[PDB]
Write a protein that binds this DNA or RNA. Structure first.
Ligand SMILES: [Mg+2]
Ligand SMILES: [Mg+2]
Ligand SMILES: [Mg+2]
Ligand SMILES: [Mg+2]
Ligand SMILES: [Mg+2]
Ligand SMILES: [Mg+2]
Ligand SMILES: [Mg+2]
Ligand SMILES: [Mg+2]
Ligand SMILES: [Mg+2]
Ligand SMILES: [Mg+2]
Ligand SMILES: [Mg+2]
Ligand SMILES: [Mg+2]
Ligand SMILES: [Mg+2]
Ligand SMILES: [Mg+2]
Ligand SMILES: [Mg+2]
Ligand SMILES: [Mg+2]
Ligand SMILES: [Mg+2]
Ligand SMILES: [Mg+2]
Ligand SMILES: [Mg+2]
Ligand SMILES: [Mg+2]
Ligand SMILES: [Mg+2]
Ligand SMILES: [Mg+2]
Ligand SMILES: [Mg+2]
Ligand SMILES: [Mg+2]
Lengths: 116, 87, 101, 70
RNA sequence: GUGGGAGAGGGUGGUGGAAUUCCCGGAGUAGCGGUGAAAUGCGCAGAUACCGGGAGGAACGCCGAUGGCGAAGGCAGCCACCUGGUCCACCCGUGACGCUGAGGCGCGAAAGCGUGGGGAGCAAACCGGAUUAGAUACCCGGGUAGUCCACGCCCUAAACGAUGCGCGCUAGGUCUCUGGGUCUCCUGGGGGCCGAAGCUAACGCGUUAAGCGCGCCGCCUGGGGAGUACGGCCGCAAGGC
């Protein structure tokens, strides 16, 4: 029960699921949710809908830490990135920014054949 | 590598008269210097073949040239082997 | 001899005495690998795009030298050594090609 | 969408330690921009790359940066 | 010769940031991953997601191109050295010195071999999970050689432009890389596209010829048997010719 003032939220959006981890302005987490966290199990884990609810339960759990406004990092290309945004900004958590940190390499690492 | 200084010391060494720039002895001499730097660049760096292709190009050219001397003038070939210390 | 720009970026938080020590050792070895200095500029503590040694700022100087080519690499390697040196780069100097063309 | 070589002062692309000019040639992220949005020619954009990398190594210029808004 | 170029042409030595993995700590809680759907798998010895730090290997994002270099094979972060080829200018030098090339010699993607290092990601074989009638597969989760480095062998290929090299002549037009020029333009050298003549079985080729000619090398002569057999040679072997 930490009384966390304002802060910053990370949307990690893959093809297969959507996870939201919200942290203090310092980088250390507070609360998080994914589609697997709410009801959904199989492929439905990566729905845009399941994503909106991840970001939603995350903003709620967070709202009760006295989280107020976040700077939203975005990483990943997935469906359910957009519903993750709209979920946050429209949670009444007010959005101080949104970003793209979405890391792509300078070509060092051979990928799995599924990715050539 | 090679500088105009060096190059010139040789040109003027082997210029068959003053102001000779491209004559046979001259051409061969320039060649020999090129060849010796390269060769010794290859005494280490055996691993760089491409430049060795270069070496081939050059040895051949100087050998044609030289043959042409031996043909034209046994004398210039005689003493340009005295000087240039080869074949 | 050939003409090179020696870029030495060092640890920003050297006070003067330290700073002149590193500045000096740079110089004595510079002189000892046979490198005469045609010019120098100390542009001092400039800020960084990405942290070097987690340090948002670094201290820059530059030496245009005429030095025997064989040793350039070695010389770099000496200036490298110091713990207070952050980044070293020797350029072979260039006639300055022009822009908006 | 303006042109980012096409208004600026005449200069040296070979000058690796000059930020104020060079960082203009980068992007809303750390990326060296296409001749399309610069307007340097062939030879130009080559030397430009080479020095921009020189600066990136030297610390002055970014390897990357993050897109803002979204 | 001289003067001026451009370039991932080669070797060696350094070295820089991104990302993956792993270890270290932080904060944090039930899942993560994965699919067509899912299971195997990993997770409360606290994973996924975020921050900090460290380690190590490998490869080089954007610039990057319809681009450039090299004889090919091939070559892409930055620096320095060591070097190969090459283009234009000047018309300065030699005076046909030229072309091609059986043999020989050198190079030669990857895979593979021997010794010695190295091993992050990937990944034959393998080990599991699916899926199907079955699935010795396609999909999923692991993983070994190997991929990396050195030295040494191997010498193959759709090693493709499926087009040997050199020189001479035969409308243009357009895009282009790189030189020189009294700089919409002219003039050399590369790379593309359309096309005169002409060629072609047609498709197409056409000043980067598959056109008109000359030199010189390699080569073919119905399909299968067969790139097999025998012989010889090379190779540690696999195998090559
Ligand atoms: Mg799922
Ligand atoms: Mg140091
Ligand atoms: Mg941990
Ligand atoms: Mg378990
Ligand atoms: Mg090829
Ligand atoms: Mg060269
Ligand atoms: Mg004349
Ligand atoms: Mg005469
Ligand atoms: Mg020949
Ligand atoms: Mg080979
Ligand atoms: Mg190999
Ligand atoms: Mg091996
Ligand atoms: Mg081994
Ligand atoms: Mg697999
Ligand atoms: Mg694997
Ligand atoms: Mg083995
Ligand atoms: Mg051929
Ligand atoms: Mg011009
Ligand atoms: Mg042309
Ligand atoms: Mg045509
Ligand atoms: Mg016709
Ligand atoms: Mg028959
Ligand atoms: Mg036999
Ligand atoms: Mg035998």
């Amino acid at each position: 029960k930490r009384q966390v003032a304002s802060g910053r939220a990370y949307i990690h959006a893959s093809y297969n699921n959507t996870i939201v981890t919200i942290t203090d302005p310092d980088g250390n987490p507070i609360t998080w949710s994914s589609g697997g966290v709410i009801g959904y199990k199989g492929s439905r884990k990566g729905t845009p809908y399941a994503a909106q609810l991840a970001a939603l339960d995350a903003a709620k759990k967070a709202m009760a830490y006295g989280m107020q406004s976040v700077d939203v990092i975005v990483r990943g290309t997935g469906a359910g990135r957009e519903q993750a945004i709209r979920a946050l900004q429209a949670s009444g958590l007010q959005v101080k920014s949104i970003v793209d940190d979405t890391p792509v390499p300078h070509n060092g690492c051979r990928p799995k054949k599924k990715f050539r | 590598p090679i500088t105009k200084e060096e190059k010139q010391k040789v040109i003027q060494e082997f210029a068959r008269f003053p102001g000779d720039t491209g004559s046979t002895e001259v051409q061969v001499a320039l060649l020999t210097l090129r060849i010796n730097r390269l060769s010794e660049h290859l005494k280490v760096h055996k691993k760089d073949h491409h430049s060795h292709r270069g070496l081939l190009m050059m040895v051949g050219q100087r050998r044609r040239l030289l043959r042409y001397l031996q043909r034209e003038d046994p004398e210039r070939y005689r003493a340009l082997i005295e000087k240039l210390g080869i074949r | 001899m050939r003409r090179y720009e020696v870029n030495i970026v060092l640890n920003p938080n050297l006070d003067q005495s330290q700073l002149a020590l590193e500045k000096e050792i740079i110089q004595r070895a510079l002189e000892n690998y046979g490198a005469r200095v045609e010019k120098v500029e100390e542009l001092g503590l400039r800020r960084l795009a990405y942290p070097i040694a987690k340090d948002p700022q670094g201290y820059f100087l530059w030496y245009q030298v005429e030095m025997p080519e064989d040793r350039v690499n070695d010389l770099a390697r000496e200036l490298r050594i110091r713990d207070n040196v952050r980044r070293v780069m020797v350029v072979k100097s260039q006639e300055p090609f022009l822009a908006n063309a | 969408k303006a042109k980012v070589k096409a208004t600026l002062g005449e200069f040296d692309l070979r000058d690796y330690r000059n930020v104020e000019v060079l960082k203009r040639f980068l992007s809303e992220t750390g990326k060296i921009l296409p001749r399309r949005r610069t307007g340097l020619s062939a030879k130009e954009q080559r030397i430009l790359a080479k020095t921009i990398k020189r600066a990136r190594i030297l610390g002055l210029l970014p390897f990357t940066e993050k897109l803002v808004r979204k």
